[PDB]
Design an enzyme around this catalytic site. Structure first.
Site, short mmCIF file in Angstrom:
data_model
loop_
_atom_site.label_atom_id
_atom_site.label_comp_id
_atom_site.label_asym_id
_atom_site.label_seq_id
_atom_site.Cartn_x
_atom_site.Cartn_y
_atom_site.Cartn_z
N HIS A 98 0.82 -1.20 0.00
CA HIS A 98 0.00 0.00 0.00
C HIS A 98 0.85 1.25 0.00
CE1 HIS A 98 -4.17 -1.09 -0.26
NE2 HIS A 98 -3.97 -2.10 0.58
N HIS A 121 -1.60 -2.98 -5.38
CA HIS A 121 -1.02 -3.06 -4.07
C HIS A 121 -0.54 -4.51 -3.79
CE1 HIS A 121 -5.30 -3.96 -2.76
NE2 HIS A 121 -4.64 -4.89 -2.09
#
Ligand SMILES: Cc1nc(N)c2ncn([C@H]3C[C@H](O)[C@@H](COP(=O)(O)OP(=O)(O)OP(=O)(O)O)O3)c2n1
Ligand SMILES: Cc1nc(N)c2ncn([C@H]3C[C@H](O)[C@@H](COP(=O)(O)OP(=O)(O)OP(=O)(O)O)O3)c2n1
Ligand SMILES: Cc1nc(N)c2ncn([C@H]3C[C@H](O)[C@@H](COP(=O)(O)OP(=O)(O)OP(=O)(O)O)O3)c2n1
Ligand SMILES: [Mg+2]
Ligand SMILES: [Mg+2]
Ligand SMILES: [Mg+2]
Ligand SMILES: [Mg+2]
Ligand SMILES: [Mg+2]
Ligand SMILES: [Mg+2]
Ligand SMILES: [Mg+2]
Ligand SMILES: [Mg+2]
Ligand code: NA
Lengths: 481, 481, 481, 481
Positions: A98, A121
């Site tokens: 992330h 991500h």
């Protein structure tokens, strides 16, 4: 190097094996302390200050809980201590990829800054895991605790991202198939990562959680389904599984897709785009990267967190002035203005590759009304929101296997009509929200006319107060009027 | 006679006006300490020890919260302190009519013991309120606090039961119409009684509540709709209102209609029916009543609580032996066995008058399988449960009105398709559960074959475990595979 | 400019008057989103991600709740809407002066960086409030909502910091004395700022709150005490007030003075001191400030948040290398090691001016144990912590006044011996923790011997683990066995 | 006969071994569904509807949690599955001996009804366990699950009541000594029964729990202390153990010894004494027992529950009229009136044998005030309450052993002065409450003068409201005034 106990407000006192502690106590993992779980949601829900770090601890803990429970109830699965540790590490590390403000980064920023690249991500999590392992000497410590890094690193990455290119996995053989359904379940979405964020987000948001993961764990068993071992739920828990996806959808509606939270994420994204040529993140060999190129070097990416927002907000350089002014407007609450919302009709679905063309389409609509101001493509934001049960148009419960109390090793399916006539008939829909960066009353009146005309031209649903905010446009379209 | 503070675990510290204290401190109200909110549900969810008394305090409190909030935000409604007190008394007293084990009494027992009568707990609440007022000298105390008993007693009873025989109410005129939507809302079911039991039942059951009543109150206003003043909600709350009925349905599914809870309520009802000729409850003038006739005399009914169960369980009278034996089997957990669950297909909706034919049909099914044991109609219980959003086949959200922030005095409707495509397509259905009184493995195997055959014969939904419990029966039905 | 409703996880849906919204939506207030309530405590308790922003909203809310409740129960106090707003603004703004990592900044960093200056977060709060009001045109908005800025600004600042120079306050006259007891109570410490942090810290830490502020509010009344109007509690609630200070002390013990949390704050402070010569913050007129001098200019101080930590951690400047290395050691969890804890015996109370001599004393102790390694003064940290009930050596309950049920406007005193013999006999103490910057097992073994010897030499209390960490030192001291 | 899952609101989903299910599903155990945990406390805290049944399930669950944790961390203890089951059964069954309204029965009723006998709920638990085992054929089921009934029944009884007649126990040898510290810890009171009632009572009362039992379990280890294996706590948890006893004391003060709760228990006790000659409970062989003699026959005691209250309240027998009248007054809230509270000064302690003489002493005080009414001994109630840390005058933490992180098998002691100067200086005290049965204003004024004079005469502490309730009496005593 013995066990640490950590007190988490959601899960209570959690035990961490010393190998897990060695992984956590790295710059690559500790980075997650500086990335908000819910991004701009904190600017709407002031309790939502929580970061990816604590969520990761929770996911790792729950991954351990599920795999241990399966192994205690079913010793014939031959789940080893090595398996348990690998599952806990995957759970711990699946949020490592992330970026700043979580979904803002991979959902909004990177698609606009680097339209040519394919970044997720999950891929970031694998790249960052690898960077963590190699930069901190973790492999010899894995060996010391009985892991085999060659196989186990592969298994951990596969649990995060899926098959890395026939049983398609290489980290574990088919008799451990069920271990791949714990951390990130690609078959149906029922995994421990959801269970953590439902409880943690709810605790912080001020909205109450209605799914019971502990109950789910007590009822889970491994059974053979189409010659593969899978995690099955008890038959009578099917209702609770429909409720689980309902709860996820409700959290998206109330919180994650809140219209002001989304506009704040859009404004932050806009400031990042304007700052991108000027912010410097140093990576390997002293090479300089930008916000948009830090994904190309994990040493730079390690230093790319929510801090970027404050580096912009506190800057004095005139080159950053425009970026800084957007963030200042967020502080004064002078937000880009909401114009309206519509939905496509049917299975009709706008794809990601068309997102960039949408502001242009709205701006090219020709409303038959006298307009003072004329707006341009770059004055509109068009936010396309997919609300679904995690499997696009599909019912995820059709991809769950169940067992009944009289034959607990025999897996079965349950269809929707066997459960309840009160359940949804569809499992995906799309909302389209439009906002205007020009905030004066003239501009906003014009923006609404462009918007309503565009909805008519695309055969989308009539905006809810369309007769009030565009009285001369709504009569052209007779299903509306 | 000043204010009392009471500490409730759901609402915290609650203030009770001295008139409310005078009502509470009577045998008619204190009776509710000996009636379980969830009846036989306590025998499945051991936290569900809570009684109607504390629920009633909660309902009275919330009724006060809503009416006060409406009056503070909208002084033009002319809500008086007298109105507030009358609404609080209605809220407090609307559970007065419940009998032993709450819904067991009016849902199962009285329909079977007195099939000729039309009894509801709401009618009981009115009769018992009247008995409370007259036996305890409450009318002079009402006068002392500014109430006008002739009008106000009428208003209070109307809030509990509806019109007591063109504006149909006599307790208040049309300009106070909205006050009838607080305690028991007959237009759409959004009332404070639900708000209390959602929070209270969840706290005790161990299931977490996901509806926020405080939010609803902050966003509620009174608006004129079709020339009547009604409680309306802000436009953006529509989604939360769909979720509120979803939460109610979910509590019915998980708890209130739990298959074992229901079978326990059935067995208790059966013991009461066998005891009914022999238990005596003394009423007005020393006349004797039975369990089934205590509803005809409020002095007797005052003494009819969950104690009846223990009076039967502890009896030595030989005439009560059969009733006592059923209760003893409950203690040993020798319960009738659950066979399965099915639903009708379509608009098909089984009426009460056909309930008696169902055990016969199950027993007459001819499963084409070798059976050792044969079962009879009297060996089967068939429990038909109606699950809906409180307005039979209707969507209650179609009967709510909404306002938007820039025109708060204009109420409008919001349709289902304006909110989401993922919402229910139907709002009522039936569950049918079958159980067997014969509990050995032979009998239970046979029972499952009869059951599954019957479902196939009636074109009902395939039982969830059908392929496991009746592998020879489920292939005959091509609608099922 | 209408009221906003905000969803807080501790208090639920809270209303913010439009004047409050105008104050909140400024760079000066939004700054508090980037300052952790508990500083380095987040590095021990991963739930403790909460910032001063949301705490401030809570304190403003609770200040409103108390002042409204007092005015509803006692209209004779003549509490005006203007009074209510001024109290809510003081509550909202009394955290404005906090610096990076909250108490770390004013408790550790500034005392070491600028030993000559007398800085508190309360003084900062006043200065920042003034800068907020003047930089954002708030005075005209105050006028619009019925405030008189000259007097009300003074009242607000006095609520935060105490008398700004015989009734000593100028913002309000003596008949409103009780209003100064809400936001920061200098008489006895019972204020709404505590009530928020007890609930909020507990929710985030994963430690459960045992004080009920709502109960306290229901029982609070204003009475005349020694010719002054004060907030009094009901007589029989005195036990709950002793419990409130016990809860505060317990939160300090478990969380706020956690030995590892404190060492992390010490290490961060050390990095800030090494960085202080190099980081530049621009303030009013383009003048340049440092981390230590930003307190002298509110424009600079506005840009001084927890971001400093990351500015240092991510720097590449060789001048920041030493500061950056300390922060890197925190990330690797290479922390200074805890040696032990002791207390002085008696009235003995170590003052701030002797803190610097303590590492030298420990290093000069001559333990009679065989030591390989010899440690120097600079190898020890000695952390002296003052634990008290908020009024130094005084019992705060001696400074509370009470009323009884038979005379609710008549104030009385209650002595400790009228309440319980189980209560503390002393109300202040000191804890002394020692740590070693040399982390190997030889050094740490030596450090423990120096430490335990020093405790014996100073007649301090025997360390809890003293017989295990220094078996050959503890027998010399007969007070200890 | 497999495992059952039960959903408890305090502990979540709990697993019950089939042997435990067989024990639970008996009339002897199910009886506990009809005995309120907190007796008359429900008449003050309306959430406190919970019964001994659910508490028992909780105690059994926690006993299992502790013993399992010890065995997992320390396999050298050789804790067997048989040990685990026996500990779970003792935990489950240690509340079997409670009578109607729990502590009311053994604390107030039996001492007055059968002053010659020495009855405790623990002895009742043993007798009832024996009756449960023998009436339900449990011994062969114990054998089936690997228990040895002769030894294991003895072990279970010893865990509940202590040694049944130099290692004094016969159920287990000295190397399993630690197993006797789980269910009912006679050395220091730290046991799982407290941990359940702290959490469960708090949940129901509306008071929040601040002790974390899960943390305690993570830190508990078995170590050799004076040649015996004992459960020790980590050294740094000593503060939490002081807080645990503080929490117990706080629950007694707020709830269990509430002045109105106590007077309700006194009134119920008085009604039972007046009913005792007339109520019949049938026991073995059809022999008849009374409320006071049901403790002598477990078949009758099985049928002695809170139902007695309602049997009396609903009776019509003229012989029960006096008992029935007392219970009716409770319903009308016509309670004996609280006059005041005082404490003796010092270690001074009123013993049980003097309780009956106390109303005479109060009535013989000669207040020097003009009195209209004169009151007699039988007009007063004097309620003596012992508040302590579970070991009379002793500090229970002096009877706990601790281990430190550097030597986890070495037990040590920690004294009070090593921990904090803010801790209690005494560990026991007495409260004396006085009440008047005459409720008119004249009588109650007189009662207060007798009471306050008596306090002055006995050098007891000044009543908290003494200056308001007796302004002419309090000036005589200069310590007070
Ligand atoms: C509920 C509650 N109560 C406490 N008294 C308490 N003390 C620390 N914690 C939290 C902080 C952490 O998240 C976790 C472990 O803290 P702990 O202080 O046990 O570990 P530390 O590493 O400092 O000690 P040792 O190395 O000496 O064993 O437990 C507490 N949590
Ligand atoms: C959280 C918590 N803390 C307490 N210390 C505490 N004491 C009583 N309660 C509960 C029990 C009741 O439900 C409610 C009122 O108890 P309270 O003792 O105030 O009322 P009582 O009628 O006995 O006193 P006065 O007539 O003297 O005014 O509050 C408490 N609740
Ligand atoms: C949080 C929550 N959610 C549910 N959906 C739910 N359904 C039942 N319970 C509660 C009631 C009980 O305390 C416990 C076990 O109920 P369960 O219905 O699992 O067991 P039952 O004995 O009826 O079924 P089987 O014989 O077929 O396995 O779980 C639930 N609790
Ligand atoms: Mg540690
Ligand atoms: Mg996922
Ligand atoms: Mg009272
Ligand atoms: Mg209703
Ligand atoms: Mg808004
Ligand atoms: Mg303070
Ligand atoms: Mg079952
Ligand atoms: Mg005990
Ligand atoms: Na139920």
């Amino acid at each position: 190097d013995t066990m640490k106990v950590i007190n988490d407000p959601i899960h209570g006192h959690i035990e961490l094996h010393p190998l897990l502690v060695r992984i956590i106590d790295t710059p690559q993992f500790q980075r997650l302390r500086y990335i908000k779980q819910l991004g701009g949601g904190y600017y709407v829900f002031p309790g939502a200050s929580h970061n990816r770090f604590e969520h990761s601890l929770g996911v790792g803990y729950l991954a351990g809980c599920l795999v241990h429970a399966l192994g205690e109830k079913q010793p014939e699965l031959q789940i080893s201590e090595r398996d348990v540790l690998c599952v806990q590490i995957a759970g711990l590390c699946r949020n490592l990829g992330h970026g700043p403000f979580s979904h803002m980064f991979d959902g909004r920023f990177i698609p606009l800054a680097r339209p040519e690249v394919k970044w997720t991500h999950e891929q970031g999590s694998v790249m960052m895991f690898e960077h963590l392992i190699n930069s901190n000497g973790i492999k010899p410590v894995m060996e010391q605790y009985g892991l085999i890094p060659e196989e186990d690193i592969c298994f951990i990455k596969e649990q995060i991202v899926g098959p890395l290119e026939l049983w398609p996995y290489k980290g574990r053989p088919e008799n451990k198939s069920f271990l791949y359904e714990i951390v990130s379940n690609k078959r149906n979405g029922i995994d421990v990562d959801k269970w953590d964020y439902f409880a943690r987000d709810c605790h912080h948001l001020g909205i109450q959680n209605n799914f019971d993961y502990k109950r789910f764990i007590k009822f889970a068993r491994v059974c053979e389904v189409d010659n593969e071992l899978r995690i099955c739920a008890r038959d009578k828990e099917v209702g609770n599984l429909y409720d689980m996806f309902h709860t996820r959808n409700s959290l998206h509606r109330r919180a994650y897709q809140h219209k002001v939270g989304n506009i704040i994420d859009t404004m932050i994204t806009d400031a990042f785009l304007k700052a991108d040529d000027y912010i410097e993140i140093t990576g390997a060999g002293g090479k300089k990267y930008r916000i948009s190129t830090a994904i190309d070097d994990m040493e730079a990416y390690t230093k790319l967190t929510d801090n970027i927002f404050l580096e912009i907000l506190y800057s004095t350089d005139p080159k950053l002035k425009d970026a800084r002014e957007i963030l200042k407007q967020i502080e004064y609450r002078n937000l880009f203005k909401y114009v309206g919302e519509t939905q496509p009709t049917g299975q009709i679905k706008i794809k990601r590759e068309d997102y960039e063309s949408l502001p242009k389409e709205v701006a090219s609509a020709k409303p038959k009304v006298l307009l003072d101001v004329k707006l341009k493509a770059e004055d509109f934001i068009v936010d396309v929101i997919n609300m679904d049960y995690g499997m696009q148009e599909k019912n995820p419960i059709d991809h769950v296997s169940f067992y009944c109390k009289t034959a607990p090793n025999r897996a079965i399916r349950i269809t929707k009509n066997q459960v309840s006539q009160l359940l949804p008939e569809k499992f995906a829909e799309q909302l389209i929200r439009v906002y205007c960066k020009k905030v004066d009353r003239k501009s906003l009146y014009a923006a609404r006319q462009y918007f309503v005309q565009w909805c008519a031209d695309r055969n989308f649903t009539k905006p809810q107060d369309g007769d009030v905010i565009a009285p001369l446009i709504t009569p052209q379209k007779k299903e509306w009027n």
